[PDB]
Design a binder for this molecule. Structure first.
Ligand SMILES: CC(C)CCC[C@@H](C)[C@H]1CC[C@H]2[C@@H]3CC=C4C[C@@H](OC(=O)CCC(=O)O)CC[C@]4(C)[C@H]3CC[C@]12C
Ligand SMILES: CC(C)CCC[C@@H](C)[C@H]1CC[C@H]2[C@@H]3CC=C4C[C@@H](OC(=O)CCC(=O)O)CC[C@]4(C)[C@H]3CC[C@]12C
Ligand SMILES: CC(C)CCC[C@@H](C)[C@H]1CC[C@H]2[C@@H]3CC=C4C[C@@H](OC(=O)CCC(=O)O)CC[C@]4(C)[C@H]3CC[C@]12C
Ligand SMILES: *[C@@H]1O[C@H](CO)[C@@H](O)[C@H](O)[C@H]1NC(C)=O
Ligand SMILES: *[C@@H]1O[C@H](CO)[C@@H](O)[C@H](O)[C@H]1NC(C)=O
Ligand SMILES: *[C@@H]1O[C@H](CO)[C@@H](O)[C@H](O)[C@H]1NC(C)=O
Ligand SMILES: [Cl-]
Ligand code: NA
Length: 521
């Protein structure tokens, strides 16, 4: 019970609610993102999560083992999830590397991004406190100016190249930060160091307090009403593009850590005769509320920056993966004693990232050791195996810390553990569960375990709402095609789009291979 609650709280509350949701909501106009957000929430987000928990508790297994007894022909979902989490682990730790770099740069007397008198800055820079001044406003030369935070993030941390075709030279300091984070993760996993006893009280109450104070600071900031209006009121015409629907569905499937093979094991740890339904509903509501209030804070900050800079809200930031690193460092600057609050906030980010990183990597290593235990479970191989896995992941992720490392990271974010592959996996899971096993068969088990019969809503949500949404989104995306573009102006080469589609197809095509191999034998 207690361990279940703590593990599930640490299993999906983290970067997916604070970093990824805000920039996807910002890129799609704001309010128009919310209607598909809630539709997909109440259609599949809670039903599929509850289905995973129930199947884990019922089979007492996870990963491929549960599908090995639910449907042998449909065991490819486990392998697809393994590939998805393996590709996700590579690019999930670059955020932690950036956080470590920011934290190390925080120890100085003055924050580096508070001004742009440094040496890594273009001549087209000035301070936001007087950017709206008449001599430096729409009167003349108001289009090519830039804020110190944008220039810092684009040059000191990234040093962005003209394109992906020009990778430049490798940056060594970010490589060292990545190595340090990987070493910390290896030390934590090898010795089995997890929060226990009374320290978990602070570990759980610190991120919420930091989020609360950040929310208060953002709400008290002038010009946040425009940000709230942008975040809430939707655009009807914008809904005619499949982009909003597909990214809302993937945000639902990502924030809840669905289709990664983790919740099945989490429910497998549970025993029979437990009320999983109430806990699952409460956790889903808590996760959604946390994301909603985090969006409040982000868009209040964005509205403040848009009001102070003099430009429109739709284009005031990167509109890409690095939205948090532009909003939050700008927010922590307004607090008294900025250094202490910056250190606290980046420690909070590190804490929210490290626990999720640990649990995902541990689940991955358990999956691989279960895949071939014959000599893995015997001897001292269970240290060198993690050593090799960490080294390979570090080498693979080293390609995203070069001069042109942002484009590869954006391609990974778009095509690796999101987009069409997650919809594919969720559609297949819902289809098999609802149509081959039978909803009545699962309600029999639910009645046996929890002693009560829920309403006739899970059956519908698994039979008619999820497959229709998945198929509609896929078909409409295929019919109306718009190629991926970093930010909004950069157009990718043909081979880059081919590589991204190959990345997605690598996860997607595991299921047909499994089916054809099972049928051939
Ligand atoms: C970054 C991406 C491209 C990495 C891709 C590799 C991994 C996703 C791992 C995870 C599970 C692994 C598989 C787990 C089990 C097997 C079975 C085994 O192959 C056989 O000999 C087939 C018969 C058997 O099951 O033993 C060893 C390779 C293979 C396909 C592994 C190949 C590498 C896989 C796909
Ligand atoms: C191991 C599995 C999971 C595949 C992983 C592939 C990608 C994560 C990486 C591996 C090697 C990378 C490539 C290696 C070097 C370059 C430099 C550059 O290629 C060029 O066209 C260079 C031309 C020139 O230098 O003259 C653009 C990015 C590219 C192709 C990289 C794109 C991203 C790639 C394909
Ligand atoms: C096609 C392009 C996009 C490159 C894809 C590279 C990899 C992501 C592919 C190449 C070979 C694939 C593997 C080929 C065979 C299998 C075995 C298959 O399982 C079985 O057939 C029985 C169980 C077993 O032994 O694994 C599960 C998918 C898997 C691991 C595949 C996972 C995905 C792999 C590693
Ligand atoms: C900017 O830095 C230079 C030296 O690097 C210094 O001479 C100058 O006074 C600084 N300007 C401001 C406004 O701080
Ligand atoms: C604009 O520049 C002038 C010149 O120094 C200064 O007096 C004024 O305060 C500036 N306006 C703002 C809003 O900072
Ligand atoms: C900004 O204005 C134009 C934009 O095309 C550019 O040519 C000019 O050099 C820039 N001037 C300043 C002062 O930034
Ligand atoms: Cl979210
Ligand atoms: Na977490």
């Amino acid at each position: 019970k207690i361990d279940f609650v703590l593990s599930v709280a640490g299993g999906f509350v983290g970067l997916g609610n604070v970093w990824r949701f805000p920039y996807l909501c910002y890129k799609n106009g704001g309010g128009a993102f919310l209607i598909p957000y809630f539709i997909f929430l109440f259609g599949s987000g809670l039903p599929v999560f509850f289905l995973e928990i129930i199947i884990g508790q019922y089979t007492s297994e996870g990963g491929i083992t549960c599908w090995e007894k639910i449907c042998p022909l449909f065991s490819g979902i486990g392998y697809a999830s393994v590939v998805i989490v393996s590709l996700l682990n590579v690019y999930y730790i670059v955020i932690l590397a950036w956080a470590t770099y920011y934290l190390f740069q925080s120890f100085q007397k003055e924050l580096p991004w508070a001004h742009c008198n440094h040496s890594w800055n273009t001549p087209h820079c000035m301070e936001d406190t007087m950017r709206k001044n008449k001599s430096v406003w729409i009167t003349i030369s108001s289009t090519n100016f830039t804020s110190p935070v944008i220039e810092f993030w684009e040059r000191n941390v990234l040093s962005l190249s003209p394109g992906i075709d020009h990778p430049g030279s490798l940056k060594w300091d970010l490589a060292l930060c990545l190595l340090l984070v990987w070493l910390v993760c290896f030390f934590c996993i090898w010795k089995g160091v997890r929060s226990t006893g009374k320290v978990v009280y602070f570990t759980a109450t610190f991120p919420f307090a930091m989020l609360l104070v950040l929310l208060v600071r953002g709400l008290t900031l002038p010009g946040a009403g425009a940000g709230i209006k942008f975040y809430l009121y939707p655009d009807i015409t914008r809904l005619e593009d499949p982009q909003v629907w597909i990214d809302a569905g993937t945000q639902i499937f990502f924030s809840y850590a669905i289709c990664l093979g983790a919740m099945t094991s989490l429910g497998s740890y549970n025993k029979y005769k437990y009320n999983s339904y109430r806990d699952c509903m409460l956790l889903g509501c808590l996760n959604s509320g946390t994301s909603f209030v985090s969006g409040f804070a982000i868009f209040s900050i964005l509205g403040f920056m848009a009001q102070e800079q003099g430009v429109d809200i739709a284009d005031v930031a990167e509109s890409g993966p690095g939205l948090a690193f532009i909003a939050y460092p700008k927010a922590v600057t307004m607090m008294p004693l900025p250094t202490f609050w910056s250190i606290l906030f980046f420690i909070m980010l590190l804490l929210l990232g490290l626990d999720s990183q640990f649990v995902e990597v541990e689940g991955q290593i358990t999956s691989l050791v279960d895949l071939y235990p014959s000599f893995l479970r015997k001897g001292y191989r269970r240290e060198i195996f993690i050593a090799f896995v960490c080294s390979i992941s570090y080498l693979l992720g080293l390609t995203m810390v070069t001069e042109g490392g942002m484009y590869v990271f954006q391609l990974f974010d778009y095509y690796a553990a999101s987009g069409v592959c997650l919809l594919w996996v969720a559609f297949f899971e819902c289809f098999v569960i609802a149509w081959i096993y039978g909803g009545d068969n699962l309600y029999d088990g639910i009645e046996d375990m929890i002693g009560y019969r829920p309403g006739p809503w899970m059956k519908y949500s698994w039979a008619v709402i999820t497959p229709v949404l998945c198929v509609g989104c896929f078909i409409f995306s295929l019919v109306k095609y718009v190629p991926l573009t970093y930010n909004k102006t950069y157009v990718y080469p043909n081979w880059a789009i081919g590589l991204g589609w190959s990345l997605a197809l690598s996860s997607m095509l595991c299921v047909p291979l499994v089916i054809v191999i099972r049928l051939c034998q």
